[PDB]
Swiss-Prot record:
Fe cation binds at residues 182, 184, 270. GO terms for biological process: cellular response to ionizing radiation; chromatin remodeling; double-strand break repair via homologous recombination; inflammatory response; positive regulation of chromatin binding; positive regulation of double-strand break repair via nonhomologous end joining; regulation of gene expression; regulation of protein phosphorylation. Ubiquitinated via 'Lys-63'-linked ubiquitin chains. Deubiquitinated by USP14 with the help of TRIM14 leading to stabilization. Its EC number is 1.14.11.66. This is Lysine-specific demethylase 4D. It catalyses: N(6),N(6),N(6)-trimethyl-L-lysyl(9)-[histone H3] + 2 2-oxoglutarate + 2 O2 = N(6)-methyl-L-lysyl(9)-[histone H3] + 2 formaldehyde + 2 succinate + 2 CO2. The modification PolyADP-ribosyl glutamic acid is found at residues 16-17. 2-oxoglutarate binds at residues 126, 192, 200, 235. It comes from the Eukaryota. Binds 1 Fe(2+) ion per subunit. Signal peptide: none annotated. Its cofactor is Fe(2+). Belongs to the JHDM3 histone demethylase family.
Amino acid sequence: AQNPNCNIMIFHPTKEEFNDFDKYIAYMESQGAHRAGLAKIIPPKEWKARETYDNISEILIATPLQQVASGRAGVFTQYHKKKKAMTVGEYRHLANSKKYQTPPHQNFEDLERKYWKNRIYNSPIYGADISGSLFDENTKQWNLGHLGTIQDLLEKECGVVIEGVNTPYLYFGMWKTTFAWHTEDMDLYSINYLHLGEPKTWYVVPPEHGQRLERLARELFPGSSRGCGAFLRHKVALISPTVLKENGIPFNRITQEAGEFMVTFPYGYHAGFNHGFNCAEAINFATPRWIDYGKMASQCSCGEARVTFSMDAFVRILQPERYDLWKRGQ
Ligand SMILES: O=C(O)c1ccnc(CNCc2ccco2)c1
Ligand code: NI
Ligand SMILES: [Zn+2]
């Protein structure tokens, strides 16, 4: 079996290998990449997402979210307070202000230490889940707005035509902005491209050990667990690497830099934080290997989790027994 220790693998495709997205994902899996839950892909040197980032300041962040923490430094929840709209130019200026800017630090490890020591004491503002794309329409390889749709994948694999669309989202970050521990909707894959700015640090649990993370989360967030059997779907829980190590949870970490892709694999729990002002683009995708994960994915039926119209069909076709209860929640 390839990659038995479930290490995060890093790939350097050539421009020829970068031509067929599905083929390359299958190749990575042939080398065991999926066992980690996360892989890094460094694009060929000939490739670019677009010409420049000089003309992005007039994008609107209609609902910036202030991420307010509760708990202890290594075990906390965050809630999202809605703020007034602002442009990307205004947001960048805010990110770079004395109140919000990245502190002096020696290296990535020092900044990680500062994050976990100090995150709960601040409330950074995140520009999340903004429908759109920054890929040039003439970028022909790994263009996140031009991937095969999940609906077409389900149809090719299962023979059922369904409604729904699948489009990319933009994420504008600043120092300490945080993505909580989660898997993707329906335990899909994701692909994430860091277009511009400062790095993003990721934590990931191997899919084969996801239930270990779930068990710890139930113990660490007992009221949330009583409220919902799939409360990690709420995307509010943070657990530090120190706490994970104390509890024997297998995980890995890696830092993504501008110009790099990350792929998350089905049922790979992940979390992380931004180093400073940045912009990422992400989308969910599927392969034939996803279908059996989609059938088994937990669902939030308590009303809290934010679900798109497109998830209806996935639940309806893959999880007909659950559909009734899940719809009552949505
Ligand atoms: O803030 C982030 O950089 C971030 C990191 C990881 N996971 C996510 C959310 N899931 C991916 C996805 C698929 C479509 C849109 O997002 C966000
Ligand atoms: Ni994600
Ligand atoms: Zn719930």
